[PDB]
Symmetry: D2
Subunit: 294 residues, 4 copies
């Protein structure tokens, strides 16, 4: 035919997260075509060159530096945005989505930009799409941070720790202590969790910003989608009347696979319920009413 | 025993090249332990945290944020340095090497810092080590850029283009046109080469700096070492009386493998000899006499 | 939707080659879905179970144990056949192809069964398909054997040797000595080649049969297809009036990519032309006239 | 120096398990050097050739076809043995171990041969070695089979199922139902387990023998060792007075890493204790007294 595609990823925002995300995919031999769009086109051109010159060296993808690219674009990762956030960001977002949609996109959205559970809801409101097709970065890196520290405590391998962080990607997130195992053996640790939650601030203070952490987390959900994993990942899924909530996007165990979210799991919560999670859901449910507008 | 090592890499200079190098190794599942040393310790601590939180997500290495680490440190990649270069840099370098050596290092040096063919010679002069154990980044990315553009021209895959850029990592490098094949079939293309040589300036102008390109190139030589490849890579090797030259480090086809360089190959040169290459060798042979001192 | 596909491979003949091919793909994390069809269904069921129980352990594909599977089946690898060959085999083949076609297959054929250059032509004659969509295993393993032995001679890495074996996958194949390089440096070696050609007989005599060799070779062309490589691989391509020949399938450098063969390259041949290659082409061109029928 | 090693694996018994194990490692780019020893030397020569010809095609290991090879041989996988088993096998084993030891081996033993928990104990008795350095294949494939079937039931990904099979690799193994989770959510399923335990017999009946299953399982523990994972794998570890038992090797959660077993975990057992596990331990504890001798 012409020269095909099949698994294309369009990253809106070639900046630290965008860039480190691409480099992840690239070095992981995850996508076929990888298109980069930034409103500072000189920067996307520049990274696209940089990616292409050592490509020879990895295991094979094609890279390219508008939105007429979100054609048969499988997945769109939206890493753009400001740094009064919420309604600046919803404003920026109001344009990114309107335009990917214009080329009649069929795909999936993966939103990495803080305040994410909020921008993830907005992405859904602005595109049309069933809410199983609009995913949010969520507490994915939070539960990675978590699983790394506990993994270090027991000196086992983080991939044998099974412990979640759910709620809002931020201050209100709570850990799910009652169903945290190491292998199949249930379990200071309240300290560990305080280091999991002030972790951003902590890395930001000594190097100005976070970006490898997440990209890696952004590279896994991509894995789950592009490969139909049916992975249980803790993302920013839309609540259904599942933890008790009816119209919010929050961080929760969801099953991932090629066609977006399959199903949100309800882990059974302590009385760490309509308390930490309700509290959390509530904090957000209201930024959505307080926020929006322009 | 205690908790082992086996394949450790110490990157001196956790900055764009250092950082993107580490992230490469990490996402490629290339080294076991990866130690990061920077004189701005707050920055190495910060990247070390960042690398560790999404580690869970890759295929398994350990990361750690002085020089008492270059112990049974397999390979030391020296990505540090200024931005009057040569003798600032030789000055900075004069301290990095003195100190990795103090912990009685046995390993290999891989020097990525411009002006590299020069700093690579200095690294050799400052450590002691046989010159087969001190490697330089060389024209490795140059011949990647080359092979990418020609690969695009013929629309084949850069990994089927076989064409080298040798000489100095800079203005004087020349391409080896007479022994450039596509598969086994020999071959504007003088244009392509002018874009290969003004490529840095070109990416630097639109994004401020180069770094993914090289790291990828830095990740391959590491591959060659750590895995005993016996790869023919165009690095910054020390000339022997091989292309006609007697005491310089320049960019040339060398065979790579666990114990440093095996042997420098003499490709047979057109009268693109004691002309482009001699010229090149000469340009450098003299910065080494002009330079040095403090 | 339902549960997707995207990159499906159907191996007809779950036997040594089939089985070791699947296990290759599996351990390489090359295809999504991998369907296995054998006329001894108890054997495909049995390997399918075997593959599924340790799957957990690799990086993620799905496996399944008729032809209603060659639906949106991307690639069909035909590893089946006897052990008076040609017209037994063309007979077996006459049924495999008729039936994959019945489910209205759109895909690509990759034929591994000796006498292959012949069965590859037959596959093309029996399906309908443009000849760029019917590929043959060819001298792919031959030039691997070649590149391994020379690679061992120079003690370099086979992946730096660039040397082809073209002609018929069998007695008449000749090596292309005049355009064989090591890096970009041209070159007993007539011995090496006699060991490349009596290699099957040699491994067959001490372990009864060959199978890992090829599968690995069968796993690469699959790579080239599924990933759009644009790889220069020496397969069994149909000659056009390219080496001088007009209606034969023989082993020759072709460029590979998602939509089948792109283009056959004419390396420039010594007077190792309308002599070894003509001879070779002729040997086959005539088994096709001698053979066929039932 | 000469030409190095670092991570060498010696497989005693190049047969289905041995062969498929090697091909696993090879296609996974797991070990550096891989040496194959079989008392039917014509068969190891033959597979070694077969592995070497398509090597070019994988990501780089070296292969070689006695015991003077268990020199600085990191790991020895013992896949040999009969098909009155126990004391035929202990007899065969009595020679393999005596001879790897003769070249003063320092390494680790990984025993794949049924009846394994028994031959694993014998390997320990015949070599000298601390029991943390002699590992057994154990219920590793059993809990893979388990996790695959449950993973299929919930339609999630086996790698999110966390459920163990412990006890003897055979009839007496029991599943640990009380601490089996899917993500962190605890749970016919007694059917699933009856299919996990009659699975060998089931695949053996339709294809004559099992081999891919295990190799894959044999490739993971190798991963754990060679890379210092600190993985929680259910192997054949020696009991200490841990589940209640004092001198037996049985299938149990152990933590794996470069220097052999770290520590056996005691998951907390239902009254699925000094009942299924005690029963199991007892069945074996006595074959060791009944067995042995010549």
């Amino acid at each position: 035919m012409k020269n095909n595609g099949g698994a294309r990823v369009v990253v809106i925002g070639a900046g630290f997260v965008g860039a480190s995300y691409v480099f992840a995919l690239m070095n992981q031999g995850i996508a076929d075509e990888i298109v980069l769009i930034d409103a500072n086109e000189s920067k996307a051109i520049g990274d696209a060159m940089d990616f292409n010159h050592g490509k020879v060296f990895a295991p094979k993808p094609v890279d390219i530096w508008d939105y007429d690219d979100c054609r048969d674009a499988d997945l769109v990762v939206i890493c753009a945005g400001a740094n009064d956030l919420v309604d600046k960001n919803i404003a920026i977002f109001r344009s990114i989505v309107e335009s990917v949609m214009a080329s009649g996109f069929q795909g999936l959205f993966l939103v990495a930009t803080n305040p994410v559970d909020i921008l993830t809801y907005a992405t859904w409101k602005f595109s049309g799409l069933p809410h199983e097709r609009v995913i949010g970065s969520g507490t994915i890196l939070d539960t990675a941070r978590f699983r790394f520290l506990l993994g270090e405590y027991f000196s086992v391998a983080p991939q044998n720790v099974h412990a979640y962080i759910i709620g809002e990607h931020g201050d209100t997130e709570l850990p799910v202590w009652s169903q945290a195992y190491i292998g199949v053996m249930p379990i200071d640790l309240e300290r560990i969790f305080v280091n999991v939650r002030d972790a951003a601030y902590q890395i930001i203070e000594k190097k100005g910003a976070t970006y490898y952490g997440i990209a890696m987390g952004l590279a896994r959900v991509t894995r789950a989608i592009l490969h139909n994993e049916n992975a249980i990942l803790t993302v920013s899924a839309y609540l259904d009347g599942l933890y008790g909530e009816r119209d919010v996007y929050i961080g929760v165990p969801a099953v991932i696979n090629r066609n977006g979210i399959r199903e949100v799991i309800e882990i059974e919560l302590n009385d760490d319920e309509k308390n930490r999670f309700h509290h959390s859901a509530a904090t957000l449910k209201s930024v959505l009413a307080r926020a929006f507008t322009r």
